[PDB]
Amino acid sequence: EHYIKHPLQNRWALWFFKNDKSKTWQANLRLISKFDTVEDFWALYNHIQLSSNLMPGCDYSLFKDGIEPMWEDEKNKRGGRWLITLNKQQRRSDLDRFWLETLLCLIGESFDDYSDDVCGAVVNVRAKGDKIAIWTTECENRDAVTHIGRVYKERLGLPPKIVIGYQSHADTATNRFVV
């Protein structure tokens, strides 16, 4: 309306996961905060601990308001994601870098109308290696999934061929595309 802060296309929610051993996986999802302007985004990001400092078994998740960072959500069950793989040795030099860029593609609606298909993103820190992915609503939407992946790989700056794949959440639970 009057631009004292710059509005975002969507309100986003940042989630935290702690690899607990006495609750259902779904019960351990913990919400950090929600925001809907660019300035509020930066105040949260700048304050909370960076991804590279997450203890193994924990995650960060950024999803559109109302979509829980889990497969069962109605917006994720038929979807899937583009996955970026990182060995543990890249944690202090690449993880945060790739995470922030991922976050900027989301709040900035970087995939044109195809950003509507985006649900959120997740970064996983594991002793065996780390992961960063963007979740889309329909692994059946070829044109949207494809476009999302092209731009994303370009935004990350990944070499001509690191080759990143897209798998449906269903498979992961029990590549449909590459770029």
């Binding site: 710059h6 509005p7 975002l8 296309q9 660019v38 300035e39 930066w42 700048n46 900027l104 709040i107 900035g108 609606e109 970087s110 044109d112 109308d113 950003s115 935004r155």
Partner: peptide
């Protein structure tokens, strides 16, 4: 639709 540039988003931290 509200779209923002990589550069503009970076400028908004100030």
């Amino acid at each position: 639709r509200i779209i923002y540039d990589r550069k503009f988003l970076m400028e908004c931290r100030n």
